[PDB]
Symmetry: C2
Subunit: 93 residues, 2 copies
């Protein structure tokens, strides 16, 4: 089954960004992710990001990816995020 | 002992760019390169380049890399270029 995604990308610079994100959120070490709308998500990288091929509602094909960050609360609230939404990633330690 | 380079970078966006170029410039691969001065060089990647730490004239440390391209008919004479000058890398030529 084809995998859908709200947004996809194919520009080299864009790819460059996504691949750099997979590298930082690679040492699976606690982080504080900031997204486009200004949202701030902190926690542990529970499911690492992996770039994959997707299609959007307009049927365009491109790259994107998802990672799951479990919050720092007692019941570790799970939150899946799309990589294109990320504008920065700073430690937590 | 410090190695000196004309320019060096510390911002994650420029490091992300520098790293993606390596991925597209594997050892011995034939490519055509777009440079930020409007020029373009084509040939064979002599050896896979690496991103390293250098010092500029003001003695500040940062990242950058050196690329060597060789050929035959093009222009002869091997050429060395600093990678921060690259704007695009396409395969086949």
């Amino acid at each position: 089954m084809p995998k859908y995604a709200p947004h996809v990308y194919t520009e080299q610079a864009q790819i460059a960004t996504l691949e750099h994100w997979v590298k930082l959120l690679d040492g699976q070490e606690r982080v504080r992710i900031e997204l486009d709308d200004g949202s701030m998500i902190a926690g542990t990288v529970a499911v690492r990001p992996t770039i994959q091929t997707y299609r959007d509602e307009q049927e365009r094909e491109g790259s994107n990816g998802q990672l799951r960050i479990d919050h720092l609360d007692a019941s570790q609230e799970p939150q899946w995020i799309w990589m294109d939404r990320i504008v920065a990633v700073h430690p937590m330690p």
